[PDB]
Amino acid sequence: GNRGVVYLGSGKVEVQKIDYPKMQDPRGKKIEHGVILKVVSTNICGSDQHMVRGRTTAQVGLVLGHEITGEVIEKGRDVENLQIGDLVSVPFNVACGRCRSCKEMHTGVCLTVNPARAGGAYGYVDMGDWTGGQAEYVLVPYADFNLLKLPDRDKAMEKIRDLTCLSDILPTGYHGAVTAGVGPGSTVYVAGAGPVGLAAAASARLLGAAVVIVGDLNPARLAHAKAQGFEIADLSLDTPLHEQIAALLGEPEVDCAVDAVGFEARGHGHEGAKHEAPATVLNSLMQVTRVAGKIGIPGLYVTEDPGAVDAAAKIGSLSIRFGLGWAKSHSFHTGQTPVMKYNRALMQAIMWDRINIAEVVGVQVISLDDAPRGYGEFDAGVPKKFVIDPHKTFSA
Amino acid sequence: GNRGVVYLGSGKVEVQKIDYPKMQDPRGKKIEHGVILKVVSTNICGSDQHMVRGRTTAQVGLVLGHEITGEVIEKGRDVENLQIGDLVSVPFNVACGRCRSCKEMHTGVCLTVNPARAGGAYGYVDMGDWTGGQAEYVLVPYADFNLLKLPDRDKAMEKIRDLTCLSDILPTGYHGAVTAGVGPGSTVYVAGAGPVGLAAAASARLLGAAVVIVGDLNPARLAHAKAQGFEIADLSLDTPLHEQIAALLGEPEVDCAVDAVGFEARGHGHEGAKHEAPATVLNSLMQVTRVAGKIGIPGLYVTEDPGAVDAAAKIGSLSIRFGLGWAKSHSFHTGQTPVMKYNRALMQAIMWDRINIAEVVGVQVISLDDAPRGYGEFDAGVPKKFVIDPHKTFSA
Amino acid sequence: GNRGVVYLGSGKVEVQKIDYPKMQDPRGKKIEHGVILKVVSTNICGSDQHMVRGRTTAQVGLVLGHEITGEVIEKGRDVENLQIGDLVSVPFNVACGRCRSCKEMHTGVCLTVNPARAGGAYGYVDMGDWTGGQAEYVLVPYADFNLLKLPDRDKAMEKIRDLTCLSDILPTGYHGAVTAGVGPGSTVYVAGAGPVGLAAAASARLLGAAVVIVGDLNPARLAHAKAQGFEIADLSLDTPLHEQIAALLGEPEVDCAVDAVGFEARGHGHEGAKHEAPATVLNSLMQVTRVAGKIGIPGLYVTEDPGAVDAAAKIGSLSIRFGLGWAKSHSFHTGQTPVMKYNRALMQAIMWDRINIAEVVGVQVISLDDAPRGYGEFDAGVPKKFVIDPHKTFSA
Amino acid sequence: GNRGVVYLGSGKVEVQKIDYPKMQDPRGKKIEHGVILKVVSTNICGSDQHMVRGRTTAQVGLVLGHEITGEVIEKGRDVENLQIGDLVSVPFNVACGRCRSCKEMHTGVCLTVNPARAGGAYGYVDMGDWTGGQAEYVLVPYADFNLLKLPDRDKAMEKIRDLTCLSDILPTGYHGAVTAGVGPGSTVYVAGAGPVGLAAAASARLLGAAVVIVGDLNPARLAHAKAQGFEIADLSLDTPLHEQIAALLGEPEVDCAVDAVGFEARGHGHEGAKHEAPATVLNSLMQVTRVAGKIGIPGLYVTEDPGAVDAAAKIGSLSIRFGLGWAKSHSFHTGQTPVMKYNRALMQAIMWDRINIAEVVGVQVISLDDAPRGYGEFDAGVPKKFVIDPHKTFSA
Numbered sequence A, B, C, D: 001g002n003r004g005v006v007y008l009g010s011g012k013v014e015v016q017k018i019d020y021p022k023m024q025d026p027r028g029k030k031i032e033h034g035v036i037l038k039v040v041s042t043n044i045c046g047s048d049q050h051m052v053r054g055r056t057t058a059q060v061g062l063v064l065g066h067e068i069t070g071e072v073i074e075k076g077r078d079v080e081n082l083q084i085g086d087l088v089s090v091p092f093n094v095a096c097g098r099c100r101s102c103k104e105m106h107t108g109v110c111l112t113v114n115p116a117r118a119g120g121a122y123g124y125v126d127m128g129d130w131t132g133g134q135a136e137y138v139l140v141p142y143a144d145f146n147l148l149k150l151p152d153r154d155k156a157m158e159k160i161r162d163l164t165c166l167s168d169i170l171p172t173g174y175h176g177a178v179t180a181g182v183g184p185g186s187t188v189y190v191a192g193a194g195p196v197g198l199a200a201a202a203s204a205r206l207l208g209a210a211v212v213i214v215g216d217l218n219p220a221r222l223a224h225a226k227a228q229g230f231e232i233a234d235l236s237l238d239t240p241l242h243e244q245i246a247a248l249l250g251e252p253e254v255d256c257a258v259d260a261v262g263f264e265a266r267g268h269g270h271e272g273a274k275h276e277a278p279a280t281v282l283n284s285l286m287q288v289t290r291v292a293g294k295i296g297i298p299g300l301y302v303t304e305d306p307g308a309v310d311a312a313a314k315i316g317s318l319s320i321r322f323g324l325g326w327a328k329s330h331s332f333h334t335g336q337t338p339v340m341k342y343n344r345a346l347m348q349a350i351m352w353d354r355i356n357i358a359e360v361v362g363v364q365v366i367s368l369d370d371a372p373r374g375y376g377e378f379d380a381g382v383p384k385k386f387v388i389d390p391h392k393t394f395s396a
């Protein structure tokens, strides 16, 4: 059998028995290029929280999870590179490797796996209805294209809390930093101290950044970031962000900025911080990024948000002070991360002890039975990254 | 003496006697690195029209003009590369060549020539108060860094209507196309059929584009674009832009898109087209650019527009459907063109007859006395690029 | 049945009855991801001439041909994107789409299709033993990754002489130009006026180059290059190449250079040009490329050349004046073209009439029975690109 | 007065009284855009050792030194950005900031400071005859373009052993790594464990490399590289380099390779390593770099080497196995480092404690009187980077 985390509506999730995976696409067409995995580790993301909070078009009954690490237990006949028993990291993007986007390495926007729009992902709104992987077992299509084979079992399993971050958050923070132009000696501001913002800060550090400033309103997440060796900015203070940056750096701007918040952003200041203001991060990043800088935006912005602040925000239309970014010659880089572009190199960085990602993001391993409470604690703001071990493969 | 085009407020300009240029900066500090030019050709830009329409903070008394081609008649002692008599193209950006931005080739955002913000330009709001060049004579500072020496007099003067476009519009259209990722075989949509949109289309063609579609509401400019060999889209029709693109290409999207309109954009449709809606072009480009595409934005967006449609638009804040561009993984590239990055190669393209820019943009040479009427005709929408010859150097 | 061109050693080729293609790799392992094509057009390359001249370790009995355009007449069970009857362009590289090289777009060096080294190709020495396609029928593996679907039958077949260049020579010329940094306004020197050098020149022109100088010692090919609109340099003259360039450009260097000759290069000068001197082109490109320039090298250099001038050259070791290139800060870009990187955009350039590649390279369509005489005429230096139409599909 | 290190021919150098610097170029033409520095730190380079060994056309009497850090004590009338007392890092390249190369950031090949060829440098053969700076005082031309202002006196002087590496070796190591494609998770091989190879290794580590293998035949330098945290390969062993790499990585190739040796390279193996063989490193890097990799070559190769192994090598012509590199699709990146491209970011990496460059390269501070013994110890292979403090400014 199988069981997984199901969205029930009204901010609730629950573990339920679900169908065992089949070798077919979501439209029921049998495939020979996929594998069925026994899930080793499967995480909870901020994107899942957006869905569970009712800020997307997600429907009741949705099986969640797009951050999978697992063992191949079955394979189709068009799977040349994986053997039964192999341990693999699964990119959250469902990609075919047989379309223009995939061939050009734009694996976040594959043209064939989703009938409604480009781009596919597991257990995710508007992403092709590929079943989620916060579960015991899951299907991965186009296995020879998507999967990253991990090192022999023993090496890999010792670092499983780090390697479970390769499915999404480490490559996502990395993509945010790279597309914001971070490199050796850069000064960087990362808005957001959730797991993706922390991964972006760790990635900026791995890239050689001179200093990373991580901003948030949540004081537990700021304390965590500071303890991990980053500088911080507290957006709930009345002190403007540019003054908090100037106090740390000697100038009110950074070389590079990353938005790791997205469409549920809060305003700034004692009062501002209390209310949602979806364009706040974009507007602040134009203010604090130096001229000709690049703004990397891994934070999610959607086409429909039923709980947004106004009619315009309900269809993703925000009041952005674009003239400011224009006057400073800023570039803006957005979208789902093409995880496959970076996951192999990041695996090598983890295996050679060049990054301590599980420590930086606050990995906490929980059972599948503890997933609903993990969602609740994460929603409350704890500075953790919940990693489910469904079969008690490594946390007995 | 000297005379130039002076902004008088209330949509009026007039030629007036102005001071002869001095070898000093706008703060009165003497400089040895500049030259004084006798102006050979000096054009009128859409940016000037924004100022003359009262859509910026420009003050009465402003001498206009930032598109200069001229002859060196005086030089300071820190000018090693120019000789009296040399014919030069002047980039519209005032850049020092002695700051981080300039050294990194971000010459549109020089850090030292403007006390108020990065970036300088002649006769332009918020750009360092460097005197404009729609005039008989003008100072160019940091001459060894900024100026592009043109071919020996005779060769260059035969193509002066083409070469006068190197100060701004050809490099600007080019920057729009390059930053939108145009190359050999690309399909391109250019919003705007004014001189910059036409230069972007010509630049896309020079870059090897398979096809360029130029959109506008002005039927004279669309007829011009069509006669120049481009495809067109008429935004005043009720037929949606994506359907007009699909009728030409077989799909409702292009590979690359350029915004050559900016902050006075009109809405689309029979009724829409009649009223201003500043976020219209940005929103439409996210709709018609394919996933993972790049949107190049040479069109001007400002920090303050006194005549905007609403309070938010008066400080450059627009209602942009950013969630759409995010869902499609779009990148956005903005700002003043770094003219020096591209003007030498574009000069070679002009001299070797690889681009016919004066024909494409509708160059029309006028006297300095005819500048106010040139402004009026340009404002009315004629499909021309007005080029003043102040001393009757080549149009007797 | 099937027939194809077979290499017989001692400079001879002959059309022979060969086996009908099978759905298997070169080792006999069955594959269900390939297609069998009915060959529509299939060309003869300069690489085939190196093999036929005995300048490689190609073995007697080799079926030649790696420039195929064809119609899908049989597909494996796991092919998702091709239908029977589709017309397709086949990149000359045999690539899997399932390894690190392919995922990173380095499809000229696929890691799994060739047991001996990275990189695969049809009918080619050290390329994995994939059967050549100067034949009636041919297998293409991993069809959903390699094949480029051509437009609706009719439009496509009208331009088949141009579209047949997409399998190799147009993307190759293009790769040489792009990796040499060619763009709008560039000055370019292309060494070699065979079909690949002519395609490099046409590609440089499509990229916007101001002027392309094509060098060769073969008068017919130089006259052809002139007729097609390029400048020329005749290496059989005693006039040094840099003087020839200076007479055309006013300076003895170009911005970009492309080696479209490879390891059978001749020396320069009246006497020099009569004798092989394999480092001649590499050495000359360092002399005529401007400082900080890039030298794109599509011309083939091999690890073993049994007929080379000396012991070192038989092992691919050449006396290259590297200190000159180093002193000028040159970069060198080499290898088999990754055809899939550029073929789709180049297809759109052909279909929209932006490049007349068949005319530029001198396409001459012939039957399969005329292939051996075509090889002979090509070996003698005719300025033609031989395109075989094996079933007389379009050349009746 | 002034004193500096003078090359006397026959492998000797001596400190002599030399002229005080003058505000003029090497031709005697007065300039008002330069500064005269009081030298704070000034290092000895492997390039100086090539000259002192008689392996270049350097002439007897040359004042050596191109690695200067100093205090502005006199400025020309046209210097805008430096004040008396400023502490500055001097890039080793003499660049004008006013030519095509400088504007495009190719400051290693400036077109105007050297009459004989592009590119200038202090105290260096074929570099324009700009006076060397292993001395008490030195002129720097075009000060507003070349100089990098260091942080407030106190912070800066505490880290002077690290900051003295910004003039050449840290940016050089960095350039070699970046142009070899090094980034987060890369595997890297650096040929050469002198100060530049050690700086390349430190730069690769700062860029995020998973592991760096440093090769040399000199045991002291290998032991140093190990102590500093890198992996090593000993080329004096009979064990082939690819086997040494395979023992460390599990595969006989690296993602990226850097040649930090240049034209006095030794062969490999117990016997081989005792003899000069100048193409050894180039040939070995093609063997150990993975397909489609990039080979960064900061190691010097010259147009004339009077002491080379053979006639061809005396003219910079080497028997390089180019067919191997071609077969593997390698690119080769060469030339003098454009120090200004990277020095400011590397300064911030030093100031924020992200790189411990002085420790890694083995900085040993000495007096000007000890320079000749420093040259001798360095020539004998000590694992040190000699930094002269001519006025005992920080090393009392």
Ligand SMILES: NC(=O)c1ccc[n+]([C@@H]2O[C@H](COP(=O)([O-])OP(=O)(O)OC[C@H]3O[C@@H](n4cnc5c(N)ncnc54)[C@H](O)[C@@H]3O)[C@@H](O)[C@H]2O)c1
Residues within 6 Å of the ligand: A045, A046, A047, A048, A049, A050, A168, A169, A172, A191, A192, A193, A194, A195, A196, A197, A215, A216, A217, A218, A221, A235, A260, A261, A262, A263, A264, A265, A266, A267, A268, A280, A281, A297, A298, A299, A300, A301, A335, A336, A337
């Ligand atoms: N692009 C991709 O591929 C991708 C992949 C993963 C997650 N995401 C998106 O990344 C974003 C972050 O994910 P997460 O897991 O870290 O989510 P999260 O909800 O745990 O973290 C967001 C953080 O932003 C903070 N925040 C709110 N307003 C702020 C403001 N004005 N300034 C600074 N911080 C502010 C919150 O307090 C919170 O700590 C989400 O939008 C998620 O959907 C994108």
Ligand SMILES: NC(=O)c1ccc[n+]([C@@H]2O[C@H](COP(=O)([O-])OP(=O)(O)OC[C@H]3O[C@@H](n4cnc5c(N)ncnc54)[C@H](O)[C@@H]3O)[C@@H](O)[C@H]2O)c1
Residues within 6 Å of the ligand: B045, B046, B047, B048, B049, B050, B168, B169, B172, B191, B192, B193, B194, B195, B196, B197, B215, B216, B217, B218, B221, B235, B260, B261, B262, B263, B264, B265, B266, B267, B268, B280, B281, B297, B298, B299, B300, B301, B335, B336, B337
């Ligand atoms: N970035 C730079 O360096 C730079 C340089 C030059 C000019 N500019 C800016 O470029 C823009 C164009 O300059 P120009 O000289 O061509 O100006 P212009 O005013 O002559 O042309 C703008 C055109 O846009 C059209 N337009 C309005 N709404 C439209 C819509 N929704 N879709 C399509 N077209 C629409 C107008 O009808 C008009 O023809 C201006 O904003 C100008 O300030 C920028």
Ligand SMILES: NC(=O)c1ccc[n+]([C@@H]2O[C@H](COP(=O)([O-])OP(=O)(O)OC[C@H]3O[C@@H](n4cnc5c(N)ncnc54)[C@H](O)[C@@H]3O)[C@@H](O)[C@H]2O)c1
Residues within 6 Å of the ligand: C045, C046, C047, C048, C049, C050, C168, C169, C172, C191, C192, C193, C194, C195, C196, C197, C215, C216, C217, C218, C221, C235, C260, C261, C262, C263, C264, C265, C266, C267, C268, C280, C281, C297, C298, C299, C300, C335, C336, C337
């Ligand atoms: N990298 C790739 O993917 C790739 C693809 C196709 C072909 N190739 C190689 O491209 C090269 C050109 O292919 P082709 O079909 O045009 O070959 P070709 O043999 O028909 O043309 C080579 C031309 O070089 C000329 N030549 C010889 N010495 C010269 C010199 N010193 N200077 C200038 N010209 C000189 C010859 O006279 C000849 O016309 C060959 O080496 C071929 O193997 C590489």
Ligand SMILES: NC(=O)c1ccc[n+]([C@@H]2O[C@H](COP(=O)([O-])OP(=O)(O)OC[C@H]3O[C@@H](n4cnc5c(N)ncnc54)[C@H](O)[C@@H]3O)[C@@H](O)[C@H]2O)c1
Residues within 6 Å of the ligand: D045, D046, D047, D048, D049, D050, D168, D169, D172, D191, D192, D193, D194, D195, D196, D197, D215, D216, D217, D218, D221, D235, D260, D261, D262, D263, D264, D265, D266, D267, D268, D280, D281, D297, D298, D299, D300, D335, D336, D337
């Ligand atoms: N491109 C630039 O801007 C630039 C700047 C500085 C120095 N350089 C050049 O960089 C090179 C290194 O400079 P350095 O100061 O470290 O010099 P160095 O002479 O102190 O070091 C070179 C090292 O290479 C070793 N070596 C010799 N043969 C070898 C082989 N086959 N494999 C590995 N190691 C081998 C030597 O034993 C020596 O330790 C020199 O050629 C120098 O001229 C270039």
Ligand SMILES: [Zn+2]
Residues within 6 Å of the ligand: A045, A046, A047, A048, A066, A067, A092, A168
């Ligand atoms: Zn996620």
Ligand SMILES: [Zn+2]
Residues within 6 Å of the ligand: A095, A096, A097, A098, A099, A100, A101, A102, A103, A109, A110, A111, A112, A113
């Ligand atoms: Zn796909």
Ligand SMILES: [Zn+2]
Residues within 6 Å of the ligand: B045, B046, B047, B048, B066, B067, B092, B168
């Ligand atoms: Zn303008």
Ligand SMILES: [Zn+2]
Residues within 6 Å of the ligand: B095, B096, B097, B098, B099, B100, B101, B102, B103, B109, B110, B111, B112, B113
């Ligand atoms: Zn500047």
Ligand SMILES: [Zn+2]
Residues within 6 Å of the ligand: C045, C046, C047, C048, C066, C067, C092, C168
């Ligand atoms: Zn070929």
Ligand SMILES: [Zn+2]
Residues within 6 Å of the ligand: C095, C096, C097, C098, C099, C100, C101, C102, C103, C109, C110, C111, C112, C113
């Ligand atoms: Zn492959």
Ligand SMILES: [Zn+2]
Residues within 6 Å of the ligand: D045, D046, D047, D048, D066, D067, D092, D168
């Ligand atoms: Zn040096």
Ligand SMILES: [Zn+2]
Residues within 6 Å of the ligand: D095, D096, D097, D098, D099, D100, D101, D102, D103, D109, D110, D111, D112, D113
């Ligand atoms: Zn220069």
